[PDB]
DNA sequence: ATCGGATGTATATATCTGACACGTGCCTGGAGACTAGGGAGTAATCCCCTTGGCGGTTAAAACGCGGGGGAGAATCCGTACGTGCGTTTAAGCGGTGCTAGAGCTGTCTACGACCAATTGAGCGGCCTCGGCACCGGGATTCTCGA
DNA sequence: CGAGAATCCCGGTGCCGAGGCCGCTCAATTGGTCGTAGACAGCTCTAGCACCGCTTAAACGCACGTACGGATTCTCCCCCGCGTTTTAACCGCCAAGGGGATTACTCCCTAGTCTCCAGGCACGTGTCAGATATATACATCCGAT
């Protein structure tokens, strides 16, 4: 049976940071959970705040707010900064 | 046909995020194509993040791989990345510490 | 097919608990640290497995499993990575 | 006579060791079978994965280190060097568990 | 320009409970909270429980499983004999 | 014409509940008609279980009403309750008590 | 208009903090307790206050408003109940 | 010789006196220029509500006592009747702040 | 202060293996192309309530001083815990066997959602008089020093 | 081991907030239809459980000694209690206008349904990164001087 997982796109992003060092099985695992832990952080956020305002659609507004609630200080500077970037560049193509 | 995870300059995936995110609403909701892209940058952002600390230390121990201890060190080494991930870590050990009062 | 357990709780060996606190990183223990530590582990392991053997009760199971103990650990706000 | 060590090296020798070593600590079989016996009063007749039983130990070593370093803290604070079960009570006290 | 409240089930719960006792407008304002509050981690335990066993909609077993979770020990028992007391005798009915 | 939530011989409303769960599942996402009579059943009895210890606590101080103060001390005196509601009343005060050796005069 | 406000963190007078120390049930108060306590009640201020902030700017408003106040409040795990 | 009571009656006498009572004990005014000059780094120029400032005023006061509470324990453990930054400092520490 | 054996600990040497890393083959799910409609943005308007200011009053804060009780520093006793040795115990590893129970696929069958009236339940506004806040006067109980 | 002071009851006066009543309107009820979620039945085959024997690491009990926890005095200085003098919070009242709360209109952005084909998942195989010994080199530790 088909199980989906973040391991490709975790050795994406490690081979691009780090031409040169590999993983363990046991490290991709933990960072498999990492990142399903903060996408569900994520959208539990941008879902009770949408529900907040009385709407019904989840748009770039509200995630970008729950980014800022969630992550501390330059931390969330630099991921709206990366964030908007991002969302220019798909807009502008 | 172009990947609309090419289109933004991200690795990872847009369309999955999408459907996860549209899994996830409450029993009406409508998610925008504009949302999964800001999503997708968040987490590759801190991916990137995590894997520049921990690659760090694996270079200071003069070796290759990564393993669980590595990614322990830089998280509790990291003041921002410890304060943001709480949960614990499956065979990472601690942070080496020895009070002055006990030498 | 089935067996009954009497008293398994001084299984946790003076050794071992004196491990643990090397570990945590103290110098010197008194005696009856070894019974609290029992005791309070013992709490702490009855409170999970009952959040765990409801977990696998709901499911029609009959086996435990490592979902299940990872879910009620996330339930008792006790996140733990790298078992799925 | 024979070569004796004053009281205290080896405890700091052996912090250093565990500390940074990175295995477990309690033996497994004595471990499986109190976790058997703790499982069995809510329900008879159960059986385990070997993953879960591990599951279960690293997070009892994990907090059972965190409360020990808690404690050693309480410690040093009353002015000793010795834990004590009154410095377990009030980490766990101010913790808010019991 | 209608709001909701339960402050008359409230107040029928009291008459029901301590036939000849007030209640004062703040302690029934916190009493709407509380109820929210319960409801509220009611429907979020069930929602998850639900998306753990990879079902689609939430039944008296959900409903049951979380408040066994939830509430301790007396408190969980009395309540799920009130639970299942009501709901056979809304079948029945 | 009857209502569903006196076929159930209760006092909180049902249709109001069931409404109110079916938005707040996921997407998709059904509401059976038992999980609201079940859902509803709970919070009637919890409701009433503070509100007996709050008049009992009343009645000592010889009043007819039930104030915020009232709720803390039912809530903070029980056990099961405490470690329910974790909240902070408003102005519901906090329960007295002074330790046995800040009592000077060593009596 | 507008105004600035120089240094209002001295309005937590020397009574003030007192009559807190009594409620919490202390009998004897040192001297640079007044201080830390103002440090301490800034820096829950502050994260609370900046909080309540986001929340107030997401929805277009300029008023903050006790509803956003207890969801931030919520948000850090310290729930209030009496205002909604 | 005029009247005078022995340091610690008149302590425990405020003590019974506003552990019984229940309304606020910060002035209001004084909070209300501290909130809107906190206030004014994040966002210029911004408007408040009446209840939010009383909200934060019972929040505020709601952990300050919980805080002097585990204080006031601090210090019975380690021998003394006086509380001290340290205290608060351990206070703060165990419970996972900063 | 040496000083000097003893002994844990770190290094740079073969060696052997199993665990990452990459190549292949699918196939299920992501990417265009229209289409409809419902949610959201925008403009206009009403009016609630938030801000700013003025004046009197009094409760609360700031200041100063005397002193008694508590925090902290030295000094001793002895007993409980750490360090080593020789036994004794059961954890651990390596096999073998076996069946209870977790997954996986199909079949209806019974559930729950949608839609169109329709009417009573619950919300908003309005009174009103009694529960409760406030005030004044005894009665009682501590508490400190003769 | 009494008198001064703080507190607790007890009775009277007034006042505004809780409880009930009335109008009304909008959403809970009731039939009737229809689509699909899942409750069972059967089958596969994975792995959790139960023995059996040898090795040996590690608990275990005992002896001895020393250093750390309390116990006891003793000093001094720091915070508490009380009286005076400022001061600014508080309350009542007024005034103006910004911005929150509704309403109507329009438009555009996203969900739904087909086609289509190519990124990821399972699976297999290889070779080299890292366990494992180990023989020195040495960095401390504690008794002796």
Same mark, same amino acid.
């Given at each position: +049976?088909?199980?989906?997982?973040?391991?490709?796109?975790?050795? @994406?992003?490690?081979?691009?940071?780090?031409?040169?060092?590999?993983?363990?099985?046991?490290?991709?695992?933990?960072?498999?959970?990492?990142?399903?832990?903060?996408?569900?952080?994520?959208?539990?956020?941008?879902?009770?705040?949408?529900?907040?305002? @009385?709407?019904?659609?989840? +748009?770039?507004?509200?995630?970008?707010?729950?980014?800022?609630?969630?992550?501390?200080?330059?931390?969330? @500077?630099?991921?709206?900064?990366?964030? +908007?970037?991002?969302?220019?560049?798909? +807009?502008?193509? | 046909?172009?990947?609309?995870?090419?289109?933004?300059?991200?690795?990872?995936?847009?369309?999955?995020?999408? #459907?996860? *995110?549209?899994? #996830? /609403?409450?029993?009406?909701? #409508? =998610?925008?194509? /504009?949302?999964?892209?800001?999503?997708?940058?968040?987490?590759?952002?801190? /991916?990137?993040? =995590? *894997?520049?600390?921990?690659?760090?230390?694996?270079?200071?121990?003069? =070796?290759?791989?990564?393993?669980?201890?590595? *990614?322990?060190?830089?998280?509790?080494?990291?003041?921002?990345?410890?304060?943001?991930?709480?949960? /614990?870590?499956?065979?990472?050990?601690?942070?080496?510490?020895?009070?002055?009062?006990?030498? | 097919?089935?067996?009954? %357990?009497?008293?398994?709780?001084?299984?946790?060996?003076?050794?071992?608990?004196?491990? %643990?606190?090397?570990?945590?990183?103290?110098?010197?223990?008194?005696? %009856?640290?070894?019974?609290?530590?029992?005791?309070?582990?013992?709490?702490?392991?009855?409170?999970?497995?009952?959040?765990?053997?409801?977990?696998?009760?709901?499911?029609?199971?009959?086996?435990?499993?490592?979902?299940?103990?990872?879910?009620? %650990?996330?339930?008792?706000?006790?996140?733990?990575?790298?078992?799925? | 006579?024979?070569?004796?060590?004053?009281?205290? $090296?080896?405890?700091?020798?052996?912090?250093?060791?565990?500390?940074?070593? $990175?295995?477990?600590?309690?033996?497994?079989?004595?471990?499986?079978?109190?976790?058997?016996?703790?499982?069995?009063?809510?329900? $008879?007749? !159960?059986?385990?994965?070997?993953?879960?039983?591990?599951? !279960?130990?690293?997070?009892?070593?994990?907090?059972?280190?965190? !409360?020990?370093?808690? $404690?050693? !803290?309480?410690?040093?604070?009353?002015?000793?060097?010795?834990?004590?079960?009154?410095?377990?009570?009030?980490?766990?006290?101010?913790?808010?568990?019991?």
């Amino acid at each position: +049976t088909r199980k989906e997982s973040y391991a490709i796109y975790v050795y @994406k992003v490690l081979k691009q940071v780090h031409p040169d060092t590999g993983i363990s099985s046991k490290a991709m695992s933990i960072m498999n959970s990492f990142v399903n832990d903060v996408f569900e952080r994520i959208a539990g956020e941008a879902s009770r705040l949408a529900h907040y305002n @009385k709407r019904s659609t989840i +748009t770039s507004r509200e995630i970008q707010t729950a980014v800022r609630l969630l992550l501390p200080g330059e931390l969330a @500077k630099h991921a709206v900064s990366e964030g +908007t970037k991002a969302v220019t560049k798909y +807009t502008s193509a | 046909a172009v990947s609309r995870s090419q289109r933004a300059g991200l690795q990872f995936p847009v369309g999955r995020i999408h #459907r996860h *995110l549209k899994s #996830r /609403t409450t029993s009406h909701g #409508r =998610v925008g194509a /504009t949302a999964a892209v800001y999503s997708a940058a968040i987490l590759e952002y801190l /991916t990137a993040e =995590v *894997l520049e600390l921990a690659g760090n230390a694996s270079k200071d121990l003069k =070796v290759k791989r990564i393993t669980p201890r590595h *990614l322990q060190l830089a998280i509790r080494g990291d003041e921002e990345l410890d304060s943001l991930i709480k949960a /614990t870590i499956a065979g990472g050990g601690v942070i080496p510490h020895i009070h002055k009062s006990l030498i | 097919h089935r067996k009954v %357990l009497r008293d398994n709780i001084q299984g946790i060996t003076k050794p071992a608990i004196r491990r %643990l606190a090397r570990r945590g990183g103290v110098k010197r223990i008194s005696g %009856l640290i070894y019974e609290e530590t029992r005791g309070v582990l013992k709490v702490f392991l009855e409170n999970v497995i009952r959040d765990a053997v409801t977990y696998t009760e709901h499911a029609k199971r009959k086996t435990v499993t490592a979902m299940d103990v990872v879910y009620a %650990l996330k339930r008792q706000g006790r996140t733990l990575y790298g078992f799925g | 006579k024979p070569h004796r060590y004053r009281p205290g $090296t080896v405890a700091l020798r052996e912090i250093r060791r565990y500390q940074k070593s $990175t295995e477990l600590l309690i033996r497994k079989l004595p471990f499986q079978r109190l976790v058997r016996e703790i499982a069995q009063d809510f329900k $008879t007749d !159960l059986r385990f994965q070997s993953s879960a039983v591990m599951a !279960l130990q690293e997070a009892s070593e994990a907090y059972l280190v965190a !409360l020990f370093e808690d $404690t050693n !803290l309480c410690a040093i604070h009353a002015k000793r060097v010795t834990i004590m079960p009154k410095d377990i009570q009030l980490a766990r006290r101010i913790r808010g568990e019991r």
